[PDB]
Amino acid sequence: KSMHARNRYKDKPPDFAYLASKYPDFKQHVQINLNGRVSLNFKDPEAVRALTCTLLREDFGLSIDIPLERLIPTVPLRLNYIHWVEDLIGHQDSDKSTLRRGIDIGTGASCIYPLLGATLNGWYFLATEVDDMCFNYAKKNVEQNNLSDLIKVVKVPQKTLLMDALKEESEIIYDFCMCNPPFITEIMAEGGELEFVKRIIHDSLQLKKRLRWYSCMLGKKCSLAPLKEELRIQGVPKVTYTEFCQGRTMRWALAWSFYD
Ligand SMILES: Nc1ncnc2c1ncn2[C@@H]1O[C@H](CSCC[C@H](N)C(=O)O)[C@@H](O)[C@H]1O
């Protein structure tokens, strides 16, 4: 399955030529290809950073500052997750009177899911990070876009996930959590992604209805089936999944709930 139908980049892909004409810091990172078209080297982190900062500024009015030494997100791909969560929670069929409350697990230096969700929909976020650099940058990025009344960035300890974040300080009910990557013997090892999502499932079995939906965007096709099986085993009553992509960058979205 392709881009989300409501993704703005579905039928308006980024125009490199337009962006080069308007943004001189972006222009210094593009070149002309064989076809005579403005292009970008997607293996150069400086160029990828410029594209991402430029798109956020152009299409969302967001100014962000991010390091070369931490993950640089790809904006069109992230929007698919935002629109999917919108579908999960019934966002299209409600109005502004309903405030929504999300958790972004491992928000990254860009704090991108909360910035997009707060900007587009006025959603609140608790945004967690274990990494010091990512935490600091995420926090500057929220503050420089004046979104700290909607987005609370928190450094959490290394070993913790959802439960340790949600105590007497917490909101009673959250609408969703979000999470994406990175995360002789016959038996294959679980690997990083499968282990990590299983920690989310484990916390969800304690929290139950304190969140309306648990979700995670998977980077590996092979994660999906064993995650579904673990959910079946545990009696989780409502499971849904789908797929999204931006060119070759593929994702498998999985969400579950303890509500009927
Ligand atoms: N248990 C945990 N709690 C919070 N953040 C975590 C975590 N384990 C890993 N992370 C963070 O998860 C991130 C990688 S996965 C999420 C990527 C993020 N949405 C982005 O766009 O950058 C890293 O920033 C890492 O520091």
From Swiss-Prot:
MF terms (GO), sorted A to Z: mRNA m(6)A methyltransferase activity; RNA binding; RNA stem-loop binding; U6 snRNA (adenine-(43)-N(6))-methyltransferase activity; U6 snRNA 3'-end binding
Domain of life: Eukaryota
Region spans: RNA-binding: 13-16, 219-223, 246-252
Phenotype when changing K22A: Does not affect methyltransferase activity
Keyword Membrane assigned: no
Family listed: Belongs to the methyltransferase superfamily. METTL16/RlmF family.
UniProt name for this protein: RNA N(6)-adenosine-methyltransferase METTL16
Organism: Homo sapiens (Human)
